[PDB]
């Protein structure tokens, strides 16, 4: 029985972000070349998966967050996390 | 017990997919840029994981699903899923 | 029940690399364009995420290892795996 993680990166510093599930709570460690920090990222989920992509300069990050058969699609672009519009049906 | 999913973006708009696994069955849900659908793949597997790659236009996915020890390789490369050649010795 | 799996891709060729988490050890499996073959990495872990970058041609990969609530990053920056800076408080 272990945490579970998700693990994304950017550019060529590079940015990274790794989501651990634990417990039932999804946070974030962040590393932009300096250290690592931990991130503003922290919701509900027993399982993680993320993907992320730059458009210019600006990433856009998408952490997919499972309970149970729900998974909740959380997104960041610049300003904030939101919920997105993924829905599955399972 | 919670679904476990993958995810994996081309491109700028981007193009998402997420793959789900659920009582045995991995599905897939797309992301084109205007809204979510339910995407070809339809495969047994416990545990999934994917990667993704542009040469030029031409988008290619590698999806890897588990069952026991037994890891099966699905191949996207523009023209249907094929499986690919990957062995594992779990 | 199943083992789990992380991949990552690089380049157009391309690399792949399927790292696969069982019984307690993560273990990779390598595509360079010719056929699968069974990587240097191998170290415990019950849970694998990755994820890997270019700078020009040169490639860079972390894989986090997980046992119980402990996160190891692995690095690979051209010339052998080495522990990483990651940390977590889980
Ligand atoms: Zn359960
Ligand atoms: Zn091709």
């Given at each position: 029985?272990?945490?579970?993680?998700?693990?994304?990166?950017?550019?060529?510093?590079?940015?990274?972000?790794?989501?651990?599930?634990?417990?039932?709570?999804?946070?974030?460690?962040?590393?932009?070349?300096?250290?690592?920090?931990?991130?503003?990222?922290?919701?509900?989920?027993?399982?993680?998966?993320?993907?992320?992509?730059?458009?210019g300069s600006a990433?856009?990050?998408?952490?997919?967050?499972?309970?149970?058969?729900?998974?909740?699609?959380?997104?960041?672009?610049?300003n904030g996390?939101?919920?997105?519009?993924?829905?599955?049906?399972?």
């Amino acid at each position: 029985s272990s945490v579970q993680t998700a693990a994304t990166s950017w550019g060529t510093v590079p940015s990274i972000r790794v989501y651990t599930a634990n417990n039932g709570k999804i946070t974030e460690r962040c590393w932009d070349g300096k250290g690592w920090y931990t991130g503003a990222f922290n919701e509900p989920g027993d399982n993680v998966s993320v993907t992320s992509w730059l458009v210019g300069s600006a990433i856009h990050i998408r952490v997919y967050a499972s309970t149970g058969t729900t998974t909740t699609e959380w997104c960041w672009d610049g300003n904030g996390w939101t919920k997105g519009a993924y829905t599955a049906t399972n």
